[PDB]
Amino acid sequence: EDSETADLKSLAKRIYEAYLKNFNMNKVKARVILSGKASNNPPFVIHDMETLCMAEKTLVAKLVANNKEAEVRIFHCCQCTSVETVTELTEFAKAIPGFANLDLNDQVTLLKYGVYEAIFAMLSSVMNKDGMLVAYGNGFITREFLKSLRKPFCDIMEPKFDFAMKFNALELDDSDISLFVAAIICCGDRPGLLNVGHIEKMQEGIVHVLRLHLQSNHPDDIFLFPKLLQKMADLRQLVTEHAQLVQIIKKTESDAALHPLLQEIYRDMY
Amino acid sequence: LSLLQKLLLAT
Numbered sequence: 203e204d205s206e207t208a209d210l211k212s213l214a215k216r217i218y219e220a221y222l223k224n225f226n227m228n229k230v231k232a233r234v235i236l237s238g239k240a241s242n243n244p245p246f247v248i249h250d251m252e253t254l255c256m257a258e259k260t261l262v263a264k265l266v267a268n269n270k271e272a273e274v275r276i277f278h279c280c281q282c283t284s285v286e287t288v289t290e291l292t293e294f295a296k297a298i299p300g301f302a303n304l305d306l307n308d309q310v311t312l313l314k315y316g317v318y319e320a321i322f323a324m325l326s327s328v329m330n331k332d333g334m335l336v337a338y339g340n341g342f343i344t345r346e347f348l349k350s351l352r353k354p355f356c357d358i359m360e361p362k363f364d365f366a367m368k369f370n371a372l373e374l375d376d377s378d379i380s381l382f383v384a385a386i387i388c389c390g391d392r393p394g395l396l397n398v399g400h401i402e403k404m405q406e407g408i409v410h411v412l413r414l415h416l417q418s419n420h421p422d423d424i425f426l427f428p429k430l431l432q433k434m435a436d437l438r439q440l441v442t443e444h445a446q447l448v449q450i451i452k453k454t455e456s457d458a459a460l461h462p463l464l465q466e467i468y469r470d471m472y
Numbered sequence: 473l474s475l476l477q478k479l480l481l482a483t
């Protein structure tokens with residue numbers, strides 16, 4: 203029995219390490235920057251078209267060395283961010299015991315359905331009520347500025363902010379969040395899985411770790427685990443609606459081409 | 473063959 207709780211504790215630690223090794227941004231780094239003690243050079247704030255063009259000239263000059271409409275340039279930046287996060291999540295996923303042992307097609311499927319849920323979960327770490335860190339911690343873009351973009355672009359982020367304000371009130375730390383992201387990835391009920399029985403067991407193992415970790419790490423909040431279970435179902439719906447919105451953009455905006463990796467993830471998703 | 477398959481095999 204001690205051999206088991208020892209392995210549960212150990213597994214929680216190893217997932218936390220894989221998370222620290224693989225993601226460029228985490229909640230601790232984001233709060234340092236935001237606090238914001240004591241980074242030498244604080245984030246450029248982007249709150250209107252002028253500050254956006256300034257940030258662009260210094261932070262992604264290529265995209266403006268040419269130019270497309272502001273809303274489209276921001277959408278391109280969003281995509282580049284998602285592509286990089288997808289790459290980070292892939293490596294994190296391969297560090298989870300048993301993931302890399304799965305059928306390549308089951309791995310693809312867990313990632314396909316999991317990445318955007320994990321992305322919006324982790325996005326919360328860089329969001330407060332006023333805005334969100336962007337460009338690897340070097341800029342901060344305001345919620346109001348995003349809302350002010352023309353339709354449909356102004357509809358992208360608000361729902362993510364709304365999710366984040368509630369997720370953030372849970373006061374999770376990175377050790378909590380690494381496990382949550384692991385449980386999102388190892389999900390037995392993704393559409394089209396081959397070896398469902400094995401993955402359900404893997405899922406149950408991870409959730410067991412998460413449940414015990416939350417018990418140790420948050421003894422003040424006895425309902426924390428059912429709360430997270432609900433957040434997972436919320437993320438599922440948040441992602442369904444995001445993809446619906448993405449399809450609308452792709453279909454009606456002549457100048458907003460989807461990156462090929464992201465089209466692959468979205469294809470036949472929901 | 474797919475981009476995701478490639479990412480998964482990348483390393």
Ligand SMILES: CC#CC[C@@H](C)[C@H](O)/C=C/[C@@H]1[C@H]2C/C(=C/CCCC(=O)O)C[C@H]2C[C@H]1O
Nearest residue numbers: 276279280281283284321336337343358448
């Ligand atoms: C300048 C600037 C800015 C803001 C961005 C750089 C910010 O860094 C982006 C964060 C994006 C959000 C905005 C999204 C748009 C969907 C389109 C891409 C997708 O469908 O992946 C999805 C969210 C995921 C995250 O990568």
